[PDB]
Amino acid sequence: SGEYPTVNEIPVGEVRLYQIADGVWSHIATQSFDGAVYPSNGLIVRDGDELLLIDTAWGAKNTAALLAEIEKQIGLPVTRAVSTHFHDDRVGGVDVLRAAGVATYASPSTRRLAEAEGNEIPTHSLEGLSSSGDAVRFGPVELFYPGAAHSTDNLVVYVPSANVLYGGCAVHELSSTSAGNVADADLAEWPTSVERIQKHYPEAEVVIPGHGLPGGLDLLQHTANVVKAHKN
Numbered sequence: 421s422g423e424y425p426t427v428n429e430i431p432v433g434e435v436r437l438y439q440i441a442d443g444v445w446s447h448i449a450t451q452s453f454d455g456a457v458y459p460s461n462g463l464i465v466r467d468g469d470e471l472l473l474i475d476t477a478w479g480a481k482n483t484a485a486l487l488a489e490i491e492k493q494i495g496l497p498v499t500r501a502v503s504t505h506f507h508d509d510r511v512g513g514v515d516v517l518r519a520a521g522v523a524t525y526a527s528p529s530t531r532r533l534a535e536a537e538g539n540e541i542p543t544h545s546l547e548g549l550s551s552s553g554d555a556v557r558f559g560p561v562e563l564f565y566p567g568a569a570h571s572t573d574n575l576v577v578y579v580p581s582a583n584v585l586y587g588g589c590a591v592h593e594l595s596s597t598s599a600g601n602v603a604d605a606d607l608a609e610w611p612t613s614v615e616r617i618q619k620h621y622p623e624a625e626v627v628i629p630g631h632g633l634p635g636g637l638d639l640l641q642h643t644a645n646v647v648k649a650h651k652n
């Protein structure tokens with residue numbers, strides 16, 4: 421009833437939306453992985469009379485539920501989606517999107533890693549993002565490649581109209597006590613990549629992590645701190 425929805429408040433298979441700013445929502449879903457349940461976030465950005473989706477809801481059935489929740493709460497069609505890295509919490513559900521008329525996009529690096537891992541593969545490649553510090557416009561957002569962090573391919577997303585920074589899984593929530601799932605991470609490079617985010621988006625007002633509660637710019641320094649300590 422108004423607070424940001426937490427892992428224990430969302431059964432696996434349901435999706436909730438949360439209004440972040442005018443024309444900007446996050447989507448929250450839950451999934452089981454290796455015998456534990458986790459929440460995960462994505463983004464929805466109004467694009468005139470259409471919507472841009474950032475990340476799936478972590479699975480085919482959750483992503484179908486996401487589309488139904490968007491129709492109920494917003495009522496505008498999702499026409500494009502971007503996946504910010506290759507893991508299943510970002511691309512799982514791309515096939516559902518593609519069958520619902522959504523054009524799916526990711527960097528070439530994400531597409532090659534998703535294919536090699538056996539995950540669902542976005543249709544279209546996003547060029548111009550292969551060197552750290554690169555940025556491109558995509559509808560109402562800017563896509564930014566900060567360098568290797570949670571994964572080598574991770575992208576962050578900025579909504580300039582609202583100064584919303586969606587960090588994806590390169591950014592952790594303030595309550596986090598470790599660096600999450602580090603299977604594909606570069607712990608040594610991650611603080612440098614976070615510093616690039618901090619330098620490029622100093623006017624961010626809301627920062628959304630890939631899992632957990634949004635906050636302010638402090639999430640970036642907190643992420644650097646937990647990553648350095650995990651590595652140690």
Ligand SMILES: Cc1nc([C@@H](C)c2cccc3c(-c4ccc(CS(C)(=O)=O)c(F)c4)c(C(=O)O)[nH]c23)no1
Pocket residue numbers: 453458507508509570589592593595596597598599600601602603604630631632
């Ligand atoms: C292989 C491979 N599969 C995956 C994905 C699908 C995956 C599965 C299960 C869990 C996660 C997490 C995760 C874990 C713990 C915390 C709490 S915390 C910051 O306090 O430790 C958290 F916030 C997030 C992440 C992420 O860190 O992005 N990804 C995950 N990744 O690699």
Ligand SMILES: [Zn+2]
Pocket residue numbers: 505507570571589
């Ligand atoms: Zn991941």
Ligand SMILES: [Zn+2]
Pocket residue numbers: 507509589630631
């Ligand atoms: Zn993640």
